[PDB]
Ligand binder design. Structure first.
Ligand SMILES: O=c1ccn([C@@H]2O[C@H](COP(=O)(O)OP(=O)(O)O)[C@@H](O)[C@H]2O)c(=O)[nH]1
Ligand SMILES: [K+]
Ligand SMILES: [Mn+2]
Length: 503
């Protein structure tokens, strides 16, 4: 055949698919009807996301009481406590969560500890989740993770077994469902071949049609200037079920918007997937480096084995990191040199990977730039970038750049796990507001200026702030004109600010 098999793999594990996830996937089926579309689900992990939420609520309740019993708690003290509390709940033998039966029993016990209407709040959620899975199982497009691991274990039981253990660790030890998906996508491609995309990506569009309209005209590229706004307007015009775009607007002109709506209506905007050579491994790097959010290879790909092997090695080293209790600066070099010699690594190039292991149980709990998180180094884009470099895969022609999917969608800006909008003090103070803990004058000024910095950094686009930050801003008075103008401008792009923009 000489082309990669026309399989389009997606992954959604840990709970029902959100409406906007189903909506994005249908766009892919609409544009690539001749592909075999497979969304991998795990019917043995129906309640992981809901368990995650119950643990976070218990964590926050414990954090409020910690703050109630300790003023002068610093931001660093707060997040150390947040990480320890999370571990204590996940490790608690009275609250097992290794399967859906244990999770359900544990979710009820946590909801009963929270009081209020939390019992019926979780009871209805459990039932809604079961109904969603019944429709999925009974109502083709879905395939089962257990059948996937079984199939891969008949090809490579060694790697199948090691990867399944890592998958289950991300499911249960951290509950980081994006990181578990970092594993599943590699197994899917290595077992069956095809193309993989994250569920928040959308097909590329025909930029030649855009240019031929003359409405979108540089020490920059057209995509970097216009793609985010165009993809907002495409989704807004399609009125995708579950979309956030009913409350968001772009900065494009009426004429620009009409042209996008026309091209979208004509069904002449999205491009179908290109053919890919069967003996090559494909990703894209045209946005901030290589990403594992979009991938393509045939089954039994040699570079894929090297990628899997490095991820498996990453977890062997993390296990040594935890047991050795490596914390301080000096202890990390006694570790980095020891690991570079134990596994034949280049210590100079590993200088960033080892320190990120400290963040393994801080991801999703402590604010951090995405490039500093453990997840990116363990299983995500940064390990992909490393293996491509180490294997010299580009020069050797075994990895190539390919335009698979666009990162410029509305949903890509909403991470299921990463937190990098507010850091340190401001993030600490924002949680206090969420906990109904009054701020002093100093904490108020810091959080207020931080909110306006985030808004101002957005320039001519919507700023997606947490609901509690909006409620914080609505409790304030005596805004300056510069600040008020920022809020009026923000209301032009998002309905979140409608109240803040009213005099
Ligand atoms: O509850 C979840 C959250 C994420 N994912 C998977 O993880 C991928 C990446 O998620 P996300 O876009 O939130 O991660 P980010 O791009 O922010 O790292 C998704 O496309 C899914 O395949 C999943 O299966 N369940
Ligand atoms: K997302
Ligand atoms: Mn994403």
């Amino acid at each position: 055949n000489n082309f990669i098999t026309h399989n389009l793999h997606t992954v959604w594990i840990g709970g029902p698919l959100p409406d906007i996830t189903k909506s994005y996937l249908k766009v892919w089926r609409d544009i690539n009807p001749d592909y075999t579309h497979i969304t991998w689900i795990d019917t043995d992990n129906k309640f992981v996301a809901l368990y995650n939420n119950a643990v976070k609520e218990l964590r926050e309740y414990t954090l409020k009481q910690y703050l109630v019993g300790d003023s002068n708690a610093t931001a660093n003290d707060y997040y150390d406590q947040a990480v320890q509390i999370e571990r204590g709940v996940r490790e608690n033998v009275y609250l097992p969560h290794g399967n859906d039966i244990e999770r359900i029993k544990t979710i009820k016990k946590i909801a009963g500890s929270l009081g209020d209407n939390k019992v019926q709040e979780y009871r209805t959620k459990i039932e809604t989740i079961e109904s969603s899975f019944v429709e999925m199982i009974d109502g083709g497009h879905y395939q089962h993770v257990s059948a996937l691991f079984e199939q891969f274990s008949e090809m490579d039981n060694l790697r199948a077994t090691a990867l399944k253990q890592i998958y289950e660790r991300e499911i249960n030890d951290r509950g980081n469902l994006a990181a578990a998906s970092d594993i599943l996508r590699l197994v899917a491609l290595q077992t069956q071949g095809g193309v993989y995309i994250d569920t928040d990506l959308l097909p590329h569009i025909d930029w030649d049609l855009i240019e031929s309209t003359k409405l979108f005209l540089d020490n920059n590229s057209v995509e970097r200037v216009y793609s985010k706004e165009i993809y907002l307007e495409i989704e807004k015009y399609k009125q995708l079920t579950g979309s956030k775009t009913n409350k968001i607007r772009s900065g494009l002109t009426k004429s620009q918007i009409n042209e996008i709506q026309r091209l979208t209506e004509e069904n002449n905007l999205f491009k179908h997937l290109n053919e890919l050579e069967k003996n090559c491994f494909y990703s894209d790097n045209s946005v901030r480096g290589w990403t594992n959010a979009m991938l393509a290879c045939n089954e039994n790909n040699g570079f894929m084995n090297a990628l899997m092997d490095r991820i498996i090695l990453n977890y062997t080293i993390l296990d040594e990191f935890i047991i050795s209790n490596i914390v301080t600066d000096g202890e990390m070099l006694n570790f980095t040199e020891k690991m570079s010699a134990q596994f034949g690594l280049n210590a100079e190039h590993e200088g960033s990977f080892i320190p990120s292991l400290a963040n393994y149980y801080k991801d999703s709990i402590v604010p951090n730039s995405p490039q500093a998180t453990a997840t990116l180094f363990m299983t995500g884009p940064t390990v992909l970038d490393t293996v491509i470099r180490v294997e010299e895969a580009v020069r050797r022609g075994i990895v190539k750049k390919e335009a698979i999917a666009s990162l410029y969608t509305v949903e890509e800006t909403f991470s299921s796990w990463s937190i990098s909008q507010f850091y340190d003090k401001a993030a600490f103070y924002l949680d206090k507001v969420k906990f109904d803990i009054s701020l002093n004058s100093a904490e108020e000024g810091i959080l207020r200026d931080s909110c306006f910095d985030v808004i101002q950094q957005s320039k001519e686009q919507a700023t997606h702030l947490p609901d509690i930050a909006i409620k914080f801003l609505e409790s304030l008075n005596n805004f300056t004109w510069k600040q008020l103008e920022l809020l009026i401008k923000a209301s032009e792009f998002s309905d979140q600010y409608k109240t803040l923009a009213t005099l």
